[PDB]
Curated annotation (Swiss-Prot):
Residues 898-971 are annotated as: Nuc-I domain. Changing residue 481 to A: Reduces cleavage of target DNA. Residues 626-655 are annotated as: Bridge helix domain. The active site is at residues 567, 845, 974. This is CRISPR-associated endonuclease Cas12b. Residues 570-571, 894-897 are annotated as: Binds non-target ssDNA. The record marks 850 as: Disrupts base stacking adjacent to scissile phosphate. Changing residue 896 to A: Nearly complete loss of cleavage of target DNA. Belongs to the CRISPR-associated endonuclease Cas12b family. Changing residue 477 to P: No cleavage of target DNA.
Length: 1085
RNA sequence: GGUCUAGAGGACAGAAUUCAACGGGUGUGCCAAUGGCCACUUUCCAGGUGGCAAAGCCCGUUGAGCUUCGAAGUGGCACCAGAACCGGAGGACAAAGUC
DNA sequence: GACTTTGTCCTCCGGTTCTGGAACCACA
DNA sequence: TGTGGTTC
DNA sequence: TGTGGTT
């Protein structure tokens, strides 16, 4: 309900080692205590425990079985009865097991599916289960917080709330379980960890009437917590595994019921390729099974195969596969799958039903995921060094051991923390101590914290660059942490210790005692994806109650109504456009008097959405220039050299194979062609490689196998040892190298926070991995060892780099949404200023379904991980809480393919750079200009500067503006997508206005397209309607309500096919003809 | 100034373009930002493990020397975390088949 | 550079389920 | 504003 | 090319 932030703080423990060893001892104690109680809970559960399987990561084993639990549980219970000196009934094994299980279901209600408060369950039971003289849980004690009906009865009047106390107390079996435990001599069930032989710490002596220390109460809660979430996962894994088995069986008899002979045929296919495979021997059940990844682009290959003869030779089937791959190599599947699907015996899989193989691939995915699906969540006890938990410390006033944050205890910015209870270690004995004050290492992050009230040392103020007035806040709980790397070690040194302090920060809205900001009633956010919907009824009165008054920054959220849409990307991290709700009674702007751009708003005819500004929120490193292009090329020059040098080293290695027909085919590829016509290698290593080739040329055929093979391996060593010194020096220049480093603020940097610099780092990792796992013996597989780490420090740098990019991306978006711009003065040299009125909503694209998937090619999956847009989305929701900024999503399908101003569909284009058209030393054509020149054969045609090149993936969106041939509307693709999201917000856009899935059928005697009813909006418009044709391309609606479905598209602007419903294929080719067909025809002249 | 609208910090193309001493401090990191030496890992490279060492880093003041108008300028940025868990996918190696 | 199949190892990205309390009464 | 057992 | 990203 309130924004919680963690500020991690480092303790200066140099001058006091006795406390550092005490903090470490306290860490081992709290972990031991939590492990003790957690292990107890697992025995009460008396079900199977599963652990991580060694000797193979994947499945799971049974660490401890149910009988093992019950047998060990009873051993503890019987021994406890003896320890408690029980002279009453001992209870049968079954009685004691049932009691323990009852207790367990009270301590972890998630085990049976109920809800549980780890705070109040641990408070309720620790003393009754560990205090010899405890009276809690029963109904005897008069202390405790008053019931809710007693608080009402004294002020706030009762009748129903006193009833709910009794009817909940009736279903409370705590008192009976406790009394049962007592009658069985288990009145203390467990031990108080601190007051037990397990701990060697000389704790402060127990007061009268005390058995439990605050340290034990922390330990016990943290055991309940982990035990609750795990039981929740035990239930979740089992449920999800049940729905998989149901998915498998509900699929075969709902997809290919009458298609049983094809199932038997693809099975023959999958074992055909299984036996005929030269790869590694199969071990998985679904090995060589037909997956969607291998069938990528099978739709195109199948239609092209349909226009062929079943008895035709292979090459016309095969060359029909090569043409589908050449159209785009990224979105293509397996050649060998299509090669075997062209064989006549297997042709029936795609001939009869052209969608059967993709259907059966979904079945195979269900088969594989089921073979790996777990049925239980692994159970892992805490450990002080392997799986650490951290000792908690309540704020001042809390019930645990507390701490105060001491502002400026030792100097201007020399803060301190006073632990009111701690551990001190002197000459090997741990002793509990009071009131230990520990200085904190300097932290500019702490400069955002100011003390609020001297009488209440918990209060604070919270600074933020995007808030004119500091937020009010309070210190919260803290936890003592160490680094994971300084944990598994022991050594003999005096290990940094940190305190992770939770800060609770109150937003300006929260400070006014309102559950939600007043503008939250205008925007409906739905689901976990925060799908944004506008209450068009309510924004007419909101503008009346909240008129724009010009207040900037955080002071303007209660005046005006603005939404900022954001188009995340890789080239530019964020592209935004800001719109303001305003009456259509407006005027001309301050610049040159041009009617402003606006969008109509559904419902209100008096109100429009006026465009305020658009901006490219580039993170540093996302610029480009002649010199920047050069440095980025040079920074990877030697890397790209070594990468191709290694690729030919492996060609040389294959020449020493024991397989005649492998070394001969490999030795051919080395002598047939020159070594480096592209000049991609280094000179000196290439010369060394050429020497070894010409040396082997004077031995090939002349010599014997075991004498030629021996020389090939001896030439690999010379060349590998040579390249080994090159990899050695390259790394020296990467770490120790003296490259220029920016000072102060500077725009236009080499890498910055860009994708390319992170990939510049990633590229180095991949090559080093490839270099270390390079094999001098042909055919051998070299993988990493079962617990190895590779390039630890480089890997940690790559991860930190992505973390910094993520947080700076979200902050840039939020600072812009609030209306702050980082501006330079050179007398101040950069400062956040409030330049614009803020936006109450940040509108992102709905991309939750744009996930990594095996159907996607790996290069597309890789970019999605580089991008990690969902991470950006989650970091936005985090950082927006304090500022009262709503972040929502908009349905994004075709957001980048239709014009935001016009509505007409379009194509993403690039413009020719002047580098390639200048007559004085022209630079080579890029990749996309080459592919375009080749498709239309424009080798003899002179391209001009800024010539539009339709590539389908450029940064410039082009759409037809009218029937005029050539009349284009061009706008930044990302900004056009951003404005499309805005246009969809104010009009309640549904995809059914533009795209429709239909199936053929009979309605009024004629064959028509029956639209699929998906969602209430598609049903509200097209349920009673049906589409007819005269030609098969252009469809028209009626009013009455093959085997594959048909997708109909529509141009809302009426420019393409007069906005009639058109089949998807021909629709996008009409779009192509009016843009690409025109640009090509004009270049040819 | 050329191209393109959204008319904005507009977007594309183009033309243009660091020592020293002393004092204090070194939360997590990033910005061209991936530490150094030794030993071990059978072997040289990569990677890892361990050991050692001084610092390297910022900030301030006083000097120099640079570089633009005697003055100024020799650093900027971001930060909500903890544990466990279930998934989704990358990466590397070998064979084979493909643009 | 891009793409597929086989296995096995290290890594990363996304989401879940717990969490980072409050307050009364007898103490001696 | 104590703690420690106790209830919310 | 055809949801979203962009070699």
């Amino acid at each position: 309900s309130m924004a919680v932030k963690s500020i991690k703080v480092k303790l200066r423990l140099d001058d006091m080692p006795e406390i550092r060893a005490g903090l470490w001892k306290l860490h081992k104690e709290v972990n031991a205590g939590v492990r003790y109680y957690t292990e107890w809970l697992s025995l009460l559960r008396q079900e199977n425990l599963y652990r991580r399987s060694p000797n193979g990561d994947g499945e799971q084993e049974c660490d401890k079985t149910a009988e093992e639990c019950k047998a060990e549980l009873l051993e503890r219970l019987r021994a406890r009865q003896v320890e408690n000196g029980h002279r009453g009934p001992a209870g049968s094994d079954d009685e004691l097991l049932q009691l323990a299980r009852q207790l367990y279901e009270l301590l972890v209600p998630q085990a049976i599916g109920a809800k549980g408060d780890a705070q109040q369950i641990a408070r309720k039971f620790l003393s009754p289960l560990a205090d010899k003289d405890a009276v809690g849980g029963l109904g005897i004690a008069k202390a405790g917080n008053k019931p809710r009906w007693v608080r009402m009865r004294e002020a706030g009047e009762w009748e129903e709330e006193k009833e709910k106390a009794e009817t909940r107390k009736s279903a409370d079996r705590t008192a009976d379980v406790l009394r049962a435990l007592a009658d069985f001599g288990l009145k203390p069930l467990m031990r108080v960890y601190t007051d037990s032989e397990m701990s060697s710490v000389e704790w402060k002596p127990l007061r009268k009437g005390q058995a439990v220390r605050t340290w034990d109460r922390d330990m016990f809660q943290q055991a309940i917590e982990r035990m609750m979430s795990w039981e929740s996962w035990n239930q979740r894994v089992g449920q999800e595994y049940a729905k998989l088995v149901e998915q498998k069986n509900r699929f075969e008899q709902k997809n290919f019921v009458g298609q049983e002979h094809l199932v038997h045929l693809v099975n023959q296919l999958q074992q055909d390729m299984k036996e005929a495979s030269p790869g590694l021997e199969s071990k998985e059940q679904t090995a060589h099974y037909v997956t969607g990844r291998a069938l990528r682009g099978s739709d195109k290959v199948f239609e092209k195969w349909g226009k062929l003869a079943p008895d035709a030779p292979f090459d016309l089937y095969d060359a029909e596969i090569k043409n589908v791959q050449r159209r785009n190599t990224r979105r293509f599947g397996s050649h060998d799958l299509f090669a075997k699907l062209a064989e006549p015996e297997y042709q029936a899989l795609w001939r009869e039903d052209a969608s059967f193989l993709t259907r059966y691939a979904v079945y195979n995915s269900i088969l594989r995921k089921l073979n790996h699906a777990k049925m239980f969540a692994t159970f892992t006890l805490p450990d002080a060094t392997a799986h650490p938990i951290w000792t908690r410390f309540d704020k001042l006033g809390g019930n645990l051991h507390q701490y105060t944050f001491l502002f400026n205890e030792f100097g201007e910015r020399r803060h301190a923390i006073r632990f009111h209870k701690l551990l001190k270690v002197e000459n090997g004995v741990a002793r509990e101590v009071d009131d230990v004050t520990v200085p904190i290492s300097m932290s500019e992050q702490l400069d955002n914290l100011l003390p609020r009230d001297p009488n209440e040392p918990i209060a604070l103020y919270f600074r933020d660059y995007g808030a004119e007035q500091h937020f009010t806040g309070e210190f919260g709980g803290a936890k003592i942490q160490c680094r994971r790397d300084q944990l598994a070690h022991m050594h003999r040194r005096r290990r940094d210790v940190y305190l992770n302090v939770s800060v609770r920060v109150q937003s300006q809205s929260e400070a006014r005692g309102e559950r939600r900001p007043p503008y939250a009633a205008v925007f409906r956010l739905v689901g976990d994806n925060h799908r944004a919907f506008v209450h068009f009824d309510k924004l007419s009165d909101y503008l009346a109650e909240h008129p724009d008054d010009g207040k900037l920054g955080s002071e303007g959220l209660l005046s005006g109504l603005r939404v900022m849409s954001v188009a995340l990307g890789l080239r530019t991290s964020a592209s935004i456009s800001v719109f303001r709700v305003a009456r259509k009674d407006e005027l001309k702007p301050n610049s040159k008097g041009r009617v402003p751009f606006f969008f109509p708003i559904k419902g209100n005819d008096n109100l429009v959405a006026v465009h305020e500004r658009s901006q490219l929120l580039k993170l540093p490193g996302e610029t480009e220039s002649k010199d920047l292009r050069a440095i980025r090329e040079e920074r990877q020059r030697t890397l790209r050299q070594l990468r191709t040098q290694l690729a030919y080293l492996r060609l040389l290695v294959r020449c020493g194979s024991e397989d005649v027909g492998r070394r001969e085919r490999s030795w051919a590829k080395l002598i047939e062609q020159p070594v480096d016509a592209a000049n991609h290698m280094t000179p000196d290593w290439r010369e060394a490689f050429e020497n070894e080739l010409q040396k082997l040329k004077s031995l090939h055929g002349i010599c014997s196998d075991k004498e030629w093979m021996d020389a090939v391996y001896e030439s690999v060593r010379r060349v590998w040892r040579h390249m080994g010194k090159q990899v050695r020096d390259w790394r020296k220049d990467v770490r120790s190298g003296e490259r220029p480093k920016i000072r102060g603020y500077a725009k236009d940097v080499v890498g910055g926070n860009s994708i390319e610099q992170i990939e510049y780092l990633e590229r180095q990792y991949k090559f080093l991995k490839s270099w270390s796992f390079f094999g001098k013996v042909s055919g051998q597989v070299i993988r990493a060892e079962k617990g190895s780490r590779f390039a630890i420090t480089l890997r940690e740098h790559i991860d930190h780099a992505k973390e910094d990019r993520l947080k700076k991306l979200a902050d840039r978006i939020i600072m812009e949404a609030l209306g702050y711009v980082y501006a330079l003065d050179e007398r101040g040299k950069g400062k956040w200023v409030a330049k614009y009125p803020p936006c109450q909503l940040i509108l992102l694209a709905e991309l939750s379904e744009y996930q990594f998937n095996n159907d996607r090619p790996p290069s597309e999956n890789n970019q999605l991980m580089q991008w990690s847009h969902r991470g950006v989305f989650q970091e936005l929701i985090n950082q927006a809480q304090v500022h009262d900024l709503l972040v929502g999503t908009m349905y994004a399908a075709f957001s980048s393919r239709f014009d935001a101003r016009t509505g007409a569909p379009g194509i993403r284009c690039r413009r020719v750079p002047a580098r390639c058209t200048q007559e004085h030393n022209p630079e080579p054509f890029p990749w996309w200009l080459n592919k375009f020149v080749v498709e239309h054969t424009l080798d003899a045609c002179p391209l001009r500067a800024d010539d539009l090149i339709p590539t389908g993936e450029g940064e410039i969106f082009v759409s037809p503006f009218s029937a005029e041939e050539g009349d284009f509307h061009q706008i930044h693709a990302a900004l056009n997508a951003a404005q499309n999201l805005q246009q969809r917000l104010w009009s309640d856009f549904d995809i059914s206005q533009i795209r429709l899935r239909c199936d053929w059928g009979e309605v009024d005697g004629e064959l028509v397209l029956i639209p699929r009813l998906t969602g209430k909006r598609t049903a509200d418009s097209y349920s009673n309607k049906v589409f007819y044709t005269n030609t098969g391309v252009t469809y028209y609606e009626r009013e009455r309500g093959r085997e594959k479905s048909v997708v109909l598209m529509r141009d809302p602007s009426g420019i393409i096919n007069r906005g009639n419903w058109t089949r998807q294929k021909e629709f996008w080719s009409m779009v192509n003809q009016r843009i690409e067909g025109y640009l090509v025809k004009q270049i040819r002249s």
